[PDB]
């Protein structure tokens, strides 16, 4: 996301797998992280949607509730037609809070 710069996206080819969002991150965009104007469904690869990784949120990796969306600001900038925006790594956020 844009909030934590150490997070990297997956950026592989997108299939027909519809992305999901958890109850904590419902309505959030993936790139710009906004709440308004949904336009495009989120398509992720088959490696990030397989086995125990199905029905899973994109950002936090929790259980998905609603469908994931792109904003119109990401649509007219065409940040939806790039690689699959699945956040893989988790660093310096929600990790050291587990140890504290």
């Amino acid at each position: 996301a844009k909030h934590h710069p150490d997070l990297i996206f997956c950026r592989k080819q997108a299939g027909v797998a519809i992305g999901r969002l958890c109850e904590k991150c419902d309505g959030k965009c993936v790139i710009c992280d906004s709440y308004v104007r949904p336009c495009t469904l989120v398509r992720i690869c088959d490696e990030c949607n397989y086995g125990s990784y199905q029905g899973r949120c994109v950002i936090c990796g929790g259980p998905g509730v609603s469908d994931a969306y792109y904003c119109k600001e990401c649509t007219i900038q065409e940040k939806d037609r790039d690689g699959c925006p699945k956040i893989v790594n988790l660093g310096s956020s929600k990790t050291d809070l587990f140890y504290e």
């Binding site: 299939g15 797998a17 007219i76 790039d82």
Partner: protein
């Protein structure tokens, strides 16, 4: 400021064409892409003609178009890849007549990029996988399956990434229930770019690579990669499995290649050239088409080269291994980009420029007389197998599909003294070129003529029975002459026939089976075979006014109005009703219509009155002689018509200035009258029959036919003069037609072309028609014709003499001098057999003065071999008298790649006397090509290229007066308005130049900020300047309000001028606009900018009146961007902001797709806009009625 886009005649040049069973039936249909337009065509086999059923705007460029058949399926599906990263699969539904978007899938970013796929496409013929491919680095594979709702399913895109690798053409290999293979030409270039020695880029030859899709393992692997000692361009699928030797054919320069892996060797066949044709200094020869065909016994390929020579490629193998390949010369056609050979003997060739053609296969196989050779026979010294071209033997000309592409230059002019203006369009490339005059009417063709004297008022049409076609009699009456002519041969006045009554006749009709009802002063006739007349019609005195005709029921009136019926009995003779209204008169006209079912009265009465009123009444025996619904009209109707045109009863009154269009319905009458205009004599609205349905001809100062072409209400005029009357016609001389004369003659008319709008009439040409000008006195045209790689006919005769010389010189002791003289005296038509090509660097050009009425070679001035014309303008100088002058810019040794010119010339011509010939005056030299001539203040301005020069006449040569050198790279066009000079750069933009009167200086004072690659221009106002580019944009630049002209002349502002102009609109079309002109297309309308594109499309930009219309159409297009998305997946706002962003322009072509959807979306958009869909459709068509055709 605020403009509105509307197309009139859409795109006609075909880039891709496919054939298949798209409707789901046994017959086959064509799907073509016009680049921007997607069309479906049906080759009707019984008549041979072509009827377009659906044409849609995908709002993008169609870079890949290919159909596939599903495994175990009947209907063929369409795969479209475009500039966007949305691959779409389409299915044609014949019920709702729309391309159903089956699946739209994302595979990458948009735009015509190098990285993202869309450029080339391949599919497995069984219908299991499809590969979309770019030029470089990625090829994506979709797996096609079907699930239990008989529904298509598509999995994830498989990857075939290969960095630093070009892709030349991709094709699918037909395998029988095997892992599908895709063949493509690849080339590695990293050793070509890392090595500066240059020779590493010469031995980097092509590699054919096979990609095998393991459906069991779900990946793409490089299976085979075999090199090529030649360079190929595209490939051809060979059908296999249980059909034959499954493989790919490789077309290459002077060669055709078979490869198939494992054990079959590389079978090579050199391509046959012509005997001694004068186009081969060192050139090669490639293909342009494949045209595979499987006739269920064997399979062949109707390949096409770049000259139009069709080659019959047929594989014959004894074993499963290939033995040898062979081909032969089939036919000659104009050069086509794609073919679609069809079942039951049809071949549709889609030319890259000019008209398209449909031929019928008359003699397939053709293995009887032609001396054909093969590949594996030991032939040496090149190809060694030649052929002589021949006229048509295997194909016959059936359909000539009209196409205005390429529109290279266009003018709106009134040279033919018509009320409406005409379009003068340059078209074609090379020998197939034509100047085409375009009108607004329809193709009315004459078949016969007669010499009926006096002053006839009307002509009525009647048959023997309802089922026949001969239409036994045709009657013509004015006051007292009967004159009921025979319809067939030997048209002449008649004696007392079986249907004739008396002389003063006034109407005829067929009421019964063979019973004719005819009306005259002693009115009632009822004649079938016995003259059973009952001519009472006596309420004392009045007997002659106001007949009206239906086929089952009768209304006639007297001085009065609502009066007697005089029906017939179903098994007997006539009867009458005694219920009369007696109607204090006020009568002008009556006209009705009837429905084909009905054992009742089953019609609707329409009467018009002298006062500002009409009256429509249903006269059923319940509610009889009681008025139903009322009226309103301004002045007087003087005409009526009732019509049913659909597959709602369309009430049409018409008045002496305009016509209306109601929507009358049978229990209740909701009219909803559409309005339109037409000396302005009183109109006549008459019912005729075309195509199987009926239509209305409303006639005025000119005629106007209103027909329903799939519920679109086309009200298009006719091309002739005023004809004062209309009536139907049917015979064996012409099946359907309209006899329509009340003025001193008689003709037989026919309406052949009905679906289109414009009237193409073509005048043939020799070379490419670059541009032309208009002579205002004694209207003629002066055109320049210029082709690169072409000879002039004197050099052609010298080259043919040289050919004859070496044919009689090379070993003539053993002799055939008949061959040389036979090549000399036989001049082939270059428009059919293809024009000869003059190597590299030759520039053929002529100048043609033409009468645009008849279209004859009124004057022709030839040039030499390396001399090309690029600019021409007529003018009248100030130092001399009234005599005209023609300035022609000619270039010599221009050679294009790389550009290094060797100086040019400017020719001056006198144009004596009235413009019928053209005499040479003088020839001045110049250092660079003068591609721009402009008359200004009695002199000429010429853009040499970085140099703008003002010239004056001299008796020896032209003399300059000024010179400017601060202008940029190269001049592309100069247009003047008075006190200002608009200079078009070939690269950046417009430049404003001021010419001084006291001095002679050319001082620049204003420029623009955007590079545009400007091609053509037009002047709208004193400040606003419009322009277009090579890419497809339309821009309008408007100056700031101050912009002081008085600038007397070192720092600039940003490397140029200082008064930077602003842009009020940028717009994208997708096609190169080559002629912009501000004019008014109809008398009584208003001004609108007419742009004519490159691929045959013609559009207009329309100004808005007030801000509420701009706001309403902006909301219409904003709602249709969300409710009705385009077909290729390209976003409409992103396509109209393709290069430059859109600014204050509403695409009305998206707005006119409101009438093509279901009424659910129409109801949603109309209730969001607080209107009704008829009101929205009327507000939409007000702009096309007022400002357009």
């Amino acid at each position: 400021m605020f403009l509105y886009n509307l197309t009139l005649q859409r795109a006609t040049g075909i880039s891709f064409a496919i054939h298949g069973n798209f409707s789901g039936t046994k017959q086959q249909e064509i799907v073509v892409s016009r680049g921007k337009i997607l069309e479906l065509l049906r080759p009707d086999p019984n008549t041979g003609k072509v009827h377009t059923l659906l044409t849609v705007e995908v709002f993008g460029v169609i870079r890949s178009l290919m159909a596939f058949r599903l495994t175990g399926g009947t209907k063929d599906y369409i795969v479209v890849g475009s500039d966007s990263g949305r691959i779409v699969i389409l299915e044609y539904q014949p019920s709702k007549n729309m391309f159903e978007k089956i699946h739209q899938e994302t595979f990458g970013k948009s735009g015509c990029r190098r990285i993202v796929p869309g450029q080339f496409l391949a599919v497995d013929p069984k219908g299991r996988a499809v590969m979309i491919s770019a030029i470089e680095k990625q090829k994506l594979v979709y797996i096609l399956n079907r699930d239990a709702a008989a529904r298509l399913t598509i999995s994830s895109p498989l990857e075939a990434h290969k960095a630093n690798t070009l892709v030349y053409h991709v094709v699918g290999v037909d395998v029988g229930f095997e892992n599908p293979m895709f063949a493509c030409l690849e080339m590695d270039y990293e050793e070509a770019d890392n090595d500066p020695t240059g020779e590493a880029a010469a031995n980097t030859q092509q590699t054919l690579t096979f990609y095998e899709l393991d459906l069991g393992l779900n990946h793409v692997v490089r299976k085979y990669s075999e090199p090529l000692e030649e360079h190929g361009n595209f490939l051809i699928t060979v059908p296999g499995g249980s059909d034959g030797p499954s493989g790919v054919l490789i077309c290459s320069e002077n060669y055709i290649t078979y490869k198939n892996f494992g054990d079959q060797p590389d079978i090579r066949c050199p391509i046959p050239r012509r005997r001694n044709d004068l186009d081969d200094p060192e050139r090669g020869m490639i293909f342009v088409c494949s045209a595979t065909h499987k006739t269920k016994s064997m399979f062949f390929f109707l390949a096409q080269t770049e000259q139009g020579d069709i080659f019959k490629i047929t594989l014959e193998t004894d074993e499963d291994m290939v033995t040898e390949i062979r081909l032969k010369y089939f036919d000659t056609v104009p050069v086509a980009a794609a073919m679609c050979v069809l079942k039951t003997g049809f071949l549709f060739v889609a030319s890259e420029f000019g008209n398209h053609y449909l031929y019928q296969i008359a003699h397939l196989g053709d293995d009887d007389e032609e001396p054909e050779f093969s590949s594996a026979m030991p032939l040496e010294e090149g190809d060694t197998f030649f052929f002589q071209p021949r006229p048509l033997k295997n194909l016959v000309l059936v359909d000539e599909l009209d196409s205005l592409s390429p529109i290279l230059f266009c003018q709106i002019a009134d040279l033919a003294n018509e009320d409406t203006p005409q379009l003068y369009v340059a078209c074609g490339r090379g020998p197939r070129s034509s100047l085409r005059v375009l009108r607004h009417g329809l193709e009315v063709s004459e078949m016969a003529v007669s010499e009926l004297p006096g002053n006839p008022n009307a002509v009525w049409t009647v048959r023997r029975h309802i089922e026949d076609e001969f239409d036994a009699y045709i009657i013509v009456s004015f006051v007292n002459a009967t004159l009921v002519l025979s319809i067939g041969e030997t048209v002449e006045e008649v004696t007392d026939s079986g249907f004739l009554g008396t002389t003063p006749t006034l109407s005829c009709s067929l009421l019964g089976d063979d019973a004719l009802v005819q009306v005259y002063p002693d009115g009632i006739r009822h004649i079938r075979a016995d003259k059973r007349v009952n001519e009472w019609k006596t309420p004392g005195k009045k007997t002659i006014v106001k007949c009206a005709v239906n086929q089952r029921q009768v209304v006639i009136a007297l001085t009065g109005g609502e009066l007697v019926y005089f029906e017939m009995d179903p098994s007997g003779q006539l009867n009458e009703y005694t219920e009369r209204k007696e109607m204090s008169a006020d009568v002008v006209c009556m006209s009705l219509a009837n429905v084909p079912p009905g054992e009742q009265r089953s019609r609707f009465l329409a009467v018009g009155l002298v006062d500002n009123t009409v009256r429509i009444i249903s006269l059923d025996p319940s509610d009889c002689l009681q008025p139903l619904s009322m009226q309103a009209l301004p002045a007087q109707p003087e005409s009526l018509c009732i019509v049913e045109m659909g597959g709602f009863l369309y009430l049409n009154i018409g008045l002496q200035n305009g016509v209306l269009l109601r929507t009358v319905l049978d229990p209740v009458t909701g009219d909803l009258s559409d309005t339109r205009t037409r000396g302005s004599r009183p109109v006549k609205l008459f019912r005729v029959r075309m195509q199987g349905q009926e239509a209305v001809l409303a006639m005025s100062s000119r005629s106007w036919l209103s027909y329903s072409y799939q519920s679109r209400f086309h009200l298009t005029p006719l091309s002739y003069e005023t004809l004062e009357f209309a009536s139907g016609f049917a015979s064996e001389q012409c099946p359907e037609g309209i006899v329509a004369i009340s003025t001193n003659t008689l003709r037989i008319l026919a309406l052949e072309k009905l679906g289109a709008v414009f009237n193409q009439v073509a005048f043939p040409l020799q070379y490419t028609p670059r541009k032309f000008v208009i002579h205002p006195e004694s209207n003629n045209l002066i055109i320049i014709e210029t082709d690169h790689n072409a000879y002039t006919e004197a050099t052609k005769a010298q080259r043919k003499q040289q050919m004859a010389e070496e044919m009689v010189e090379a070993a003539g002791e053993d002799l055939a001098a008949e061959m040389a003289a036979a090549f000399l005296n036989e001049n082939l038509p270059e428009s059919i057999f293809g024009a000869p090509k003059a190597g590299n660097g030759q520039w053929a050009s002529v100048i043609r003065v033409m009468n645009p009425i008849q279209g004859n070679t009124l004057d022709l001035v030839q040039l030499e071999q390396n001399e090309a014309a690029f600019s021409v303008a007529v003018c009248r100088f100030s130092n001399t008298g009234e005599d005209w002058y023609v300035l022609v810019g000619v270039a010599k040794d221009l050679i294009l790649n790389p550009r290094s010119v060797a100086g040019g010339f400017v020719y001056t011509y006198k144009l004596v006397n009235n413009g019928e010939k053209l005499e040479f005056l003088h020839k001045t030299p110049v250092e660079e090509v003068p591609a721009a001539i402009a008359p200004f203040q009695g002199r000429v301005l010429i853009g040499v290229g970085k140099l703008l020069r003002v010239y004056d006449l001299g008796k020896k040569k032209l003399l300059r007066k000024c010179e400017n050198k601060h202008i940029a790279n190269y001049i592309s066009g100069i247009q003047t308005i008075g006190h200002r000079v608009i200079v078009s750069d070939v690269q950046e933009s417009f430049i404003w130049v001021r010419y001084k009167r006291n001095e002679n200086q050319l001082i620049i004072f204003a420029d623009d900020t955007y590079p545009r690659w400007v091609t053509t221009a037009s002047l709208l106002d004193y400040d606003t300047v419009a322009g277009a580019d090579k890419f497809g944009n339309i821009c309008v630049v408007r100056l700031p309000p101050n912009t002081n002209d008085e600038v007397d002349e070192d720092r600039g502002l940003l490397n140029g001028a200082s008064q930077k102009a602003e842009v009020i609109m940028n717009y994208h079309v997708g096609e190169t606009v080559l002629s912009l002109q501000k004019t008014t297309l109809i008398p009584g309308g208003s001004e609108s900018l007419v742009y004519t594109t490159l691929s045959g499309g013609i559009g207009i930009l329309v100004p808005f009146t007030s801000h509420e219309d701009h706001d309403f159409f902006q909301h219409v297009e904003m709602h249709l961007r969300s409710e009705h998305p385009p077909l290729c997946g390209r976003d409409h706002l992103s396509f109209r902001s393709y290069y430059f962003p859109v600014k204050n322009v509403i695409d009305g072509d998206l707005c006119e797709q409101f009438n093509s959807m279901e009424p659910n979306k129409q109801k949603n958009v109309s209730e969001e806009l607080d209107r009704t869909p008829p009101e929205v459709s009327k507000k939409l068509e007000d702009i096309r009625t007022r400002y357009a055709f």
